[PDB]
Amino acid sequence: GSHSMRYFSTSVSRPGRGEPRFIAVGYVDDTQFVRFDSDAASQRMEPRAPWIEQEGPEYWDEETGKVKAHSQTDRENLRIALRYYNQSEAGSHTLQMMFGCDVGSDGRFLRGYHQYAYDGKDYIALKEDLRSWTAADMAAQITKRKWEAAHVAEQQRAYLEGTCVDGLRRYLENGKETLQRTDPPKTHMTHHPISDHEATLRCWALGFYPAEITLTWQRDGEDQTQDTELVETRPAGDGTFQKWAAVVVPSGEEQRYTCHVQHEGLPKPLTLRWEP
């Protein structure tokens, strides 16, 4: 159905510890497919998924050109930020960019993004209409005035609506068996006594793709959020994801509680219930 493409870039300065470093990664949904690292000896945009390796050398030349240009631009942008914020030459600083587009089931444009952050806080962001900029502080007002003068929003809007959408559609067909798969979660429960009068029911979801999932606990109905522990969804390392939900229940009342799993790979929501 719906799909997203994302580029995440990080530029860091580290005076006295190394030259400024730029790292960019590209994602289709939860699958990384390219990377560029200004420290590596390649100096090329590199493949990170087997299905992007089918692209010809004209692709890698063009992508490498755009990402080395960004590498140079965002390293200079760290120096520009030092002036905007009147900061020392000696500090270490972080500059991040996120870019990409979403498409619906039909493959048509849904929403695009192009946002920056400086030292972990929002710097500038292209608004929803792709026509104006949100400047978070006073330094970013200068960049906003610069990008209005260079008509940056108009160029990025055409890029987000055209090449981004067309590229995503192309990626989805070339890596179809990987990117349009849905691996449903494999589920089970564990029972761990805390005391003689209390126990932990932990509801497990393993090996699912994509990462979006809902784990909820209910007793006899209604959300049992009271002491519902919920770990952040985590990568298994093989392309699938993991999550679990746990609640503490009075001993002997386990049959009252049910775990509900909702995921794109499950046609109907699962209701799991523990049993000796």
């Binding site: 945009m45 992508e63 755009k66 960004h70 905007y84 960019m97 610069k146 160029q155 090449t163 067309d166």
Partner: peptide, 8 residues
């Protein structure tokens, strides 16, 4: 596809 990027 990688985007065009601009200076601050």
């Amino acid at each position: 596809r990688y985007p065009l990027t601009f200076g601050w």
